[PDB]
Structures are given as structure tokens and as C-alpha cells.
């Protein structure tokens, strides 16, 4: 069984982003943030921990591209996730997604745009 | 800042059960504690025991009038009665659709709302 990875770039910078309907979060780890160059949007009020773990921040609305399109998200940033990024059910819902598994792609129910999930062999 | 799950109706052998959709699990775990409701206890291959119990390696779940063939490991203590997890997701060809608020079954067509708040487990 083949885990839901998409590809997808922030400020630029490719990832694959895990896709969980069953997180209520989406997270990106300090690493990817840093990588990413977008410490800059990393609001430190909303520090915490996490189930299970430093929570550093949260990012407001940044964008995260998939394809050609650049959808507004939030999310927050956590210590050594090891995974670079984490696409939970808040961003799921906020742009009205379907993870079709007939045709395998991730549809952005907002703009339209599909992108293929990744084949075993890209996965992280 | 920071710092509604989905589920489903579903039944199996004619026991109504809540099930969390999760596309992260890889693996459809229905608690110990549902297949003794559903009464099938009888269909827990024991072989497969890890807490893991067993595994069910064919079982039907119903989806409003489909009847979807399935398997599942089934995990003594685990708190909802069903998570269903990418293997079964994909082996039905599954949309989880947020837009129309769906989870659609691909080979059938049937299509199922995702639980308000208010009816969650």
C-alpha cells in the first residue's frame, strides 16, 4: 500500500507533502521551514507541544504551489518532524479537496488543478 | 491561530458502526471490543496476532447498499470502532471529496456524507 505524497514548492523550493485526512493540522518541519527560507513567517506566539515535540511557530497564510497554482495556508512548524511536510484536513477543507484514488491525484476543489499522487519509487 | 474529523456511517453484518476516514493509516483496523458487536469473532484469524488479535481476511462492509469486500486487522483496545486506512481506500477506488462533503466509492459509484460534529463517535 502506497502511502499519498504530492509534489508541491514553497517560496520556490520543491517537497513532497505527506497527505493525511486524518491529521487536523498541516505541519512542516523546522528543517523544510529553514530550507524553504520562510523563517521569516514564522510567528513564535504560537509556540507550544505537540501529541506525542516543540511546536515553533505558525506560519499565516503562506503560499504553497502545486502545479501552476498558489493556494493560501496556513500552518505550523515543528522540531525534527522528520517528514518535510504534513497536508492535514484543515488545508483538505479550506480549498475543498478531493484525494481521488480512481485516478490517483489530489483535486484542488477551488481552482481545479490536479496533481498526480507519487509513484512508490519518489516517495521520501 | 492554533496551538471536524471525517467519518462515515457504515455497517457490517448488519451492526451500524462510525468509521474515521484516514488516508495516512496504511492499514483498516476495526477495535476487538465492534467485532464482538458485529458479531464477527468467528472470522478473526488469530495467526496474524501481534495489541494486534488478529486479522479478518474477508468481511463485508456495508456502504448505504453497497457491500464492499474487505479485510482488516483487528486491535484489542484501539478507542473508535473502525479506522479505515488507505488500503482499503484505494482497493475500492475510493474519493474522499470535500467539496461535495463525500466519500465516494469508485467501483460502484455510491456515495456516502461525511458525519456533522455533532454526529461524530
Known amino acids: 500500500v502506497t502511502m499519498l505524497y504530492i509534489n508541491c514548492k514553497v517560496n520556490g523550493h520543491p517537497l513532497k507533502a505527506f497527505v493525511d485526512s486524518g491529521a487536523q493540522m498541516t505541519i512542516m518541519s523546522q528543517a523544510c521551514a529553514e530550507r ?3 523563517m521569516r513567517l514564522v510567528d513564535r506566539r ?14 499565516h497564510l503562506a503560499q504553497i504551489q502545486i502545479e501552476g497554482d498558489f493556494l493560501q495556508c496556513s500552518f ?8 518535510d511536510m504534513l497536508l492535514g484536513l484543515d488545508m483538505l477543507r479550506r480549498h475543498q479537496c478531493s484525494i481521488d484514488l480512481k485516478k ?4 484542488i476543489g477551488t481552482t481545479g488543478t490536479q496533481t498526480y ?3 512508490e ?3 521520501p
Open 76 to 83: 505550523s512548524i515543528l522540531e525534527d518532524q522528520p517528514m
Open 46 to 59: 504560537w509556540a507550544g507541544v505537540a501529541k506525542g515535540q516543540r511546536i515553533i511557530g505558525r506560519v
Open 117 to 119: 499522487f507519487l509513484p
Open 121 to 123: 519509487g519518489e516517495l
Open 104 to 107: 490517483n491525484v489530489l483535486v
Open 36 to 38: 524553504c527560507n520562510i
